Symmetry: C5
Amino acid sequence: MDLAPQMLRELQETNAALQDVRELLRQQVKEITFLKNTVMECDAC
Amino acid sequence: MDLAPQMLRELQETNAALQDVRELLRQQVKEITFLKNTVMECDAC
Amino acid sequence: MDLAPQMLRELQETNAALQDVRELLRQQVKEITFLKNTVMECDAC
Amino acid sequence: MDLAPQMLRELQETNAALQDVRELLRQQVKEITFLKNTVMECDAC
Amino acid sequence: MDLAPQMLRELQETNAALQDVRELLRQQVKEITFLKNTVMECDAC
Ligand SMILES: CCCCCCCCCCCCCC(=O)O
C-alpha cells in the first residue's frame, strides 16, 4: 500500500539495529564493571 | 487498515529495547563515576 | 479501530526515552573526560 | 483526524536527537581511546 | 499534501544514523576491552 511496505521494512531494520546496540551495551557494562572492581582492588591505590 | 498493526508492533518492540538501553546507560554512568572517584583517591596517583 | 493515535503515542514515548538517553550520554562523556584527565595526572604513570 | 503531520514531527525530532547522540558517542570514543593509550604508556605497569 | 514520501526519508535517516551508532559502539567496546586488559597486566597493582 503505497510506501507503507517500505516504511515497515525500515522499522524492522531499526528494531534489528537496536537489538545489536542492546547486546553491545550489555557487554560494555560488564567490562566497565570489571574495570571498576579491578582498580577498586589495586594495592598501589 | 494497511500495515498499521505491523508497524505498531515494531514501534512497541523498539520502545521496549530503548527503555532497556536507557536503564543500561543509567547503570553504566554510575559505574564510570565510581571508577572515576576511585582513581581520584588512588594514593599511587 | 484506528491504530494511528496509538502509533503516535509510541513515537512520543520513543522521543521521551531517547531524550533521557541523550542526557545520560552527555553526562557520561563528562565523567569519562574527567577520568581521562585524572589518569593523565597520575604520578605513578 | 490526520495524524501524519504530528507523526512526521516526531520522526524529525527523533533524527535530531540521534544526531546529537552520534556526535556525543564520537567524542566519547576519542576520550576512551586516549585513556587506553595513556594507561598503555603508564610507568607503574 | 502527502507526507508519506518525507516520512519514509526520515525513517531511512534513522537507520543510517543508527548504523553509525552501532559501528561506533563496537569500536568503543574494543577500546574499553583493551583498557581492561592493560590494567590487568599492570604490575603496579
Ligand atoms: C527509534 C530508534 C531508537 C533510538 C536508538 C537509540 C540509540 C542509543 C545508543 C546508546 C549509545 C550508548 C553510549 C554509551 O554509553 O556507550
